[PDB]
Amino acid sequence: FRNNYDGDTVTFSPTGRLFQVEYALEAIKQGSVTVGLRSNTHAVLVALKRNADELSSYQKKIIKCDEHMGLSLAGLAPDARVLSNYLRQQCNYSSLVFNRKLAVERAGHLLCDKAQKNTQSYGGRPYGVGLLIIGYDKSGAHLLEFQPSGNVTELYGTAIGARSQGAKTYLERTLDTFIKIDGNPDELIKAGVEAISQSLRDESLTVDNLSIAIVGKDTPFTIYDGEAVAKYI
């Protein structure tokens, strides 16, 4: 079975599955956990940075795309660099040509279409990384979940990566609460850090291990690492 239909992205299995895409999705599950959640005034990204040795640094997981948009990654870092770069350009194009800030919803559509092309043609390969996009545009705060299959969804909160299921259940429980944490960034963040620690197991979030990002009403997308995240541990 599978072995005969998983040679490339241009082959459908007898049950209508695309294995190369499913294998790419598996690289996400092997990636470190990251969480995202929003209220009506702010959107937050929380990520657990992974290190190789105790002599190495913890690889960044959050990338800024514009003053009002950013994302967190889980899976192949290089693919995240390619995709975030494409998004940086799309945000750029929107500002230069229409003097308009790119709608988060539109960014999701562009990402979906870019990923899709790599699941229907020969020679290419699907992107092997998951993305959580947050932003504040003309219709408020937003959170998107991007999958290499091309499926992009808008949520109040979510999580991807290994053991991501813990945080996801916690968020699906805390909903009514954090969704109302308006005009209070520090609270939304703590709400996110609590969600991520629901997927811990190995260790505990430290200072050079935690990474947070926020965007909102009067808050440009900014990234907090190290000492700057101490007050949340």
Partner: peptide, 19 residues
């Protein structure tokens, strides 16, 4: 693919000009 085309995401005079 713009559910807010006749509201918050409608074309602004400034977008039309820049274009």
């Amino acid at each position: 693919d713009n559910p807010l085309a006749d509201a918050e995401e409608a074309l602004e005079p400034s977008y039309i000009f820049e274009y």
